[PDB]
Swiss-Prot record:
This is Green fluorescent protein. Changing residue 204 to V: In EBFP1.2; shifts the excitation and emission spectra to shorter wavelengths and increases quantum yields compared to BFP. Changing residue 191 to A: In mut1.5; shifts fluorescence lifetime from 3.03 to 2.72 ns. It holds the Pfam family GFP. SUPFAM superfamilies: GFP-like. The lineage of its organism: Eukaryota, Metazoa, Cnidaria, Hydrozoa, Hydroidolina.
Length: 229
């Protein structure tokens, strides 16, 4: 038997992303468009900073800027919280701690508007160092790849996740970003609460050679794993 939300991801689905941010009083907005194909766990997106120059490095915003596009293997389909919450959607909140520097706090709503999957985000960043790796733009425009560790939060009818991203710094060192995540459903309907597992995620960053606005092109693959059969 196929689930309710799962049917909405059987083809290629268009994606819109909108972010409003404020980091140490530098206000900025990002808009993104692309497509997701959950059969393959594949996302292709382009993001543009609509207010001018982005005041933080693009790689720092990747995790914030739609885990419902994860490929869940057939034997793990009963563990896909993200699709089960659709089309009504879910709230995704994070705190992201940059080691020896500031933190981002994010809140997003992820839901369908008609045929389009929308991710609407507010981001607040505080306590960043003006000469640090973030505000000082010392991070490599480099891929990021890691595992998102998911567990159920039966108390909230949702999930929690934790993971670390290691951003490469221009001098060969690493800037750690510790992520803490909570997702909760927006609707009242039932959702699937998973056993422990993870999402193996890889994001490749590139540029559009014809684009003069400050932008990021992204190709991403996301696959669920860690349960055995």
């Amino acid at each position: 038997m196929v689930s309710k939300g799962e049917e909405l991801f059987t083809g290629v689905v268009p994606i819109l992303v909108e972010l409003d941010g404020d980091v140490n009083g530098h206000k900025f907005s990002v808009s993104g468009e692309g497509e997701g194909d959950a059969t393959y766990g594949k996302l292709t997106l382009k993001f543009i900073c609509t207010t001018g120059k982005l005041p933080v490095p693009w790689p720092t915003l990747v995790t914030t800027l739609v885990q419902c596009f994860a490929r869940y293997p057939d034997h793990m389909k009963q563990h896909d919280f993200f699709k089960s919450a659709m089309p009504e959607g879910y709230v995704q909140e994070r705190t992201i701690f940059f080691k020896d520097d500031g933190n981002y706090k994010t809140r997003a709503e992820v839901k369908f508007e008609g045929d389009t999957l929308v991710n609407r985000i507010e981001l607040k960043g505080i306590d960043f160092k003006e000469d640090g790796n973030i505000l000082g733009h010392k991070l490599e425009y480099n891929a990021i790849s890691d595992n998102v560790y998911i567990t159920a939060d039966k108390q909230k009818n949702g999930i929690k996740a934790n993971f670390k991203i290691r951003h490469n710094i221009e001098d060969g060192s690493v800037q750690l970003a510790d992520h803490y995540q909570q997702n909760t459903p927006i609707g009242d309907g039932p959702v699937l609460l998973p056993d422990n597992h993870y999402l193996s995620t890889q994001s490749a960053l590139s540029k559009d050679p014809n684009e003069k606005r400050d932008h990021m092109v992204l190709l991403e693959f996301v696959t669920a794993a860690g349960i055995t059969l």
